[PDB]
């Protein structure tokens, strides 16, 4: 039922990026692994939702 009704999506999993400032606790705005969001993402996974 879900495979019939859902649309194909790419799912990628959140984790906090280890670029957070050890004092201020905020992301580095230049971080390449996360583009200023505090959250980095694992490689994408194909799923239907």
């Amino acid at each position: 039922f879900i495979n019939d009704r859902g649309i194909k999506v790419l799912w990628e999993e959140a984790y906090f990026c280890p670029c957070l400032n050890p004092d201020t606790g905020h992301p580095r705005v230049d971080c390449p692994r996360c583009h200023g969001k505090g959250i980095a993402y694992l490689p994408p996974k194909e799923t239907i939702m």
Binding site: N21, D23, R28, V29, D30, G36
Partner: protein
């Protein structure tokens, strides 16, 4: 004149912000008190000629989306009239004078005078930089030229100077009528990164300190006074919050009009008439 503090601030902040951001050691000095990683990340992202991100400035209520990574929002505030003159006479003039200007110029020889040429008719000369003339020097101003005796000054035949002067509109009499107003403008540095908001605050305070010496707010917009708000989420229900710290800039300035007087009197005349009663 009538004045628009918001448009002044926009016009003044944008070039100054650009010229600081293109100059790495200035930011390195401004941010010396911040955490090392905050400083280096800001300098890497926004600073220097290769900077891939950019800051932006504009008024509130645009119809389009802004650069919420770093944006100075300018926001015209309250004001009130504070001090009035008797008769509302702010000043009087014999010759309608425009804005104050400073221009670079060089001397040239002409007919055994030195002259400086200026782009506009000189309504009043305030200062020729680094020169004080004696009466022997026969200082004269005429049209858009300043003229200066050659005889003793031949060594200066190509001397480079700055002229501080003011335009003239026209040869007319009048009264400058008006009053003083105290007026507020708010500025906030929006960023979705809190450390960027804190750095934009520091940069803005530096810019305003530097601005206090400018001719614009030396002659007008006097007594700059700064107040600072809390850091808070400006918007809270996106995929992320947007933060900012407001600052309020308060200025005292004159609002006035040139009331020209057409009446002129150039001769009294006397007559005696006899009363035979």
């Amino acid at each position: 004149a009538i004045t628009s503090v918001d448009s002044y601030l926009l016009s003044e902040i944008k070039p100054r912000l650009n010229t600081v951001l293109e100059n790495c050691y200035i930011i390195d000095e401004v941010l010396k008190d911040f955490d090392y990683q905050t400083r280096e990340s800001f300098k890497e992202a926004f600073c220097g000629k290769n900077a891939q991100h950019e800051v932006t400035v504009g008024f509130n209520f645009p119809k389009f989306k802004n650069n919420y990574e770093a944006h100075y929002l300018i926001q015209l505030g309250q004001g009130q009239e504070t001090k009035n003159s008797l008769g509302s006479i702010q000043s009087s003039y014999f010759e309608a004078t425009g804005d104050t200007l400073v221009e670079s110029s060089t001397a040239i020889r002409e007919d055994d005078k030195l002259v400086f040429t200026v782009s506009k008719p000189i309504g009043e000369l305030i200062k020729v930089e680094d020169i004080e003339f004696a009466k022997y020097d026969n200082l004269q101003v005429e049209g858009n030229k300043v003229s200066f005796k050659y005889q003793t000054n031949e060594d200066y035949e190509n001397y480079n100077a700055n002229i501080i002067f003011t335009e003239k509109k026209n040869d007319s009499k009048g009264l400058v009528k008006g009053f003083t107003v105290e007026e507020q403008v708010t500025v906030v540095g929006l960023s979705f990164n809190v450390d960027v908001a804190r750095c934009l605050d520091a940069v803005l305070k530096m810019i305003l300190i530097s601005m206090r010496d400018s001719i614009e707010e030396q002659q007008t917009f006097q007594l700059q006074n700064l107040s600072f708000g809390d850091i808070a989420p400006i918007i809270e229900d996106g995929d992320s919050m947007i933060f900012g710290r407001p600052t309020i800039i308060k200025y005292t300035s004159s609002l006035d009009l040139d009331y020209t007087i057409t009446q002129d009197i150039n001769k009294l005349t006397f007559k005696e008439r006899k009363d035979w009663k």
